[PDB]
Amino acid sequence: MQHITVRLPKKARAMIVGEITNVFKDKYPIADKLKVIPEYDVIEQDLCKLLSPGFPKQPLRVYKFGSRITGIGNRSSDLDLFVDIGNTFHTFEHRASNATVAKLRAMRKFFCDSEDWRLINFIEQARVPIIKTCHLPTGIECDICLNSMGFCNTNLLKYIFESQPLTQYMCIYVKNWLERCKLTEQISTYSITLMVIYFLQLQALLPPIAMLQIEDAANQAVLVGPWVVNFAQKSFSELGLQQLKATVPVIKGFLRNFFAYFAKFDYEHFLVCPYIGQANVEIAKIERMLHARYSAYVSDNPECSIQLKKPMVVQDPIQLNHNVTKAVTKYGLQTFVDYCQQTAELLEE
């Protein structure tokens, strides 16, 4: 029923009307602490010990990433691990290749046989196939992949969150909001993180990612396939962006404005575009605004262009052909919009 608002779930409502301090009192210090704990070194070492014998002629490196590493995790969060066997970091796979699937299938057996690991699921169909497994000595659930792109995203978020901590507080809040709204099947934590980033770029509080990726005499791209995955780690002082101290009042006001903005966004004509970082980025124009490697990649691979004929378009700022909200349905978008509207209303002073 499109003429009736979807009602905000009571689990979300109680948290929104509740003091925002309660949101963070335990959550931010926990998330900060979980960026680095000694358990992760045990996991990394155990993973290398387990898998190295099985790939004895190749270099092996483990890259940890995800919400724990960026600073928005909690004690139940999974740890994402990219296992790079044979210098595959710089190889881009739109859909996993046969050779990648074969490596993942071989790795599954190691976790299966090992007493130190419980195999939870082997997810082969996914866009990013993963092994979900529990590291039993620590009890931390680990998502093992063979794709470097999520790790690259994590390093960009770390820079963003460390430079402008308001972003981190906002992302902790909206992650919890998504969960209480029961929206995570359609809108991921990473998708709403990119929405927070884009919103703050419009406030001149974060740089466009394209700005951080100028290719000139002093700066060369790190490429994963056609994607530029590095960025200049410029101080915000040098970028001319102010660095705010996140207080409860500042956070609440930015959250109010965030939800109001996405309640009234025109998803039919515009996309959320942290690459460009400017207002009103048109769906009709975005593909002509990307770097030349995007055009060359899609020219050679026309089935791999960004999916724009979708209710909700949120573009990954590194993997520019990925609409991270491509699975949002018309009703799912209406639900999100209605929840944003009601949340902004409840955050008014």
Author numbering: 201 to 549
Per the authors:
Terminal uridylyl transferase (TUTase) is one type of enzyme that modifies RNA molecules by facilitating the post-transcriptional addition of uridyl ribonucleotides to their 3′ ends. Recent researches have reported that Drosophila TUTase, Tailor, exhibits an intrinsic preference for RNA substrates ending in 3′G, distinguishing it from any other known TUTases. Through this unique feature, Tailor plays a crucial role as the repressor in the biogenesis pathway of splicing-derived mirtron pre-miRNAs. The structure of Tailor contains two canonical globular domains separated by a large catalytic groove, which serves to accommodate the 3′ ends of the target RNAs for the post-transcriptional addition of uridyl ribonucleotides.
The overall architectures of Tailor in all models are almost identical and resemble the previously reported structures of the other TUTases, belonging to noncanonical nuclear poly(A) polymerase of the DNA polymerase β superfamily. The catalytic domain (CAT) of Tailor consists of a mixed five-stranded β-sheet (β1–β5 strands) packed tightly by two α-helices (h2 and h3) from one side, exhibiting a typical folding of the DNA polymerase β family enzyme. Three conserved catalytic aspartic acid residues (Asp278, Asp280 and Asp 343) sit closely with their side chains all pointing outward from the other side towards the groove. The central domain (CD) of Tailor, on the other hand, is made up of a long α-helix (h1) and a core region of six closely packed α-helices (h4–h9) which is a homologue to the central domain of PAP. The juxtaposed CAT and CD are physically connected through the linkers of h4–β5 and h1–h2. In addition, a highly conserved loop, which has been previously termed as nucleotide-recognition motif (NRM), also exists in the CD of Tailor. Although the overall structures of Tailor in apo and RNA-bound forms are highly similar, careful comparison did reveal a structural perturbation, upon the RNA binding, occurring on a region next to the exit of RNA-binding groove, which is mainly constituted by H294 and R295 from the loop connecting h2 and h3 (L23), R327 from SSL loop, as well as N521 and K525 from NRM loop. Specifically, in RNA-bound structures, the portion of L23 loop (H294 and R295) and SSL loop slightly shifted towards each other upon the RNA binding, forming a direct hydrogen bond between the side-chain of R295 from SSL and the main chain atom of Q325 from L23, which is not observable in the apo-form structure of Tailor. In addition, the side-chain of H294 forms two direct hydrogen bonding interactions with Q519 and N521 while H294 also forms three water-mediated hydrogen bonds with N347, Y500 and N521 using its main chain atoms, in both complex structures. All these H294-related hydrogen bonds were not observed in the apo-form structure of Tailor, reflecting a higher degree of rigidity for this region in the RNA-bound structures, which is consistent with its B-factor profiles in three models.
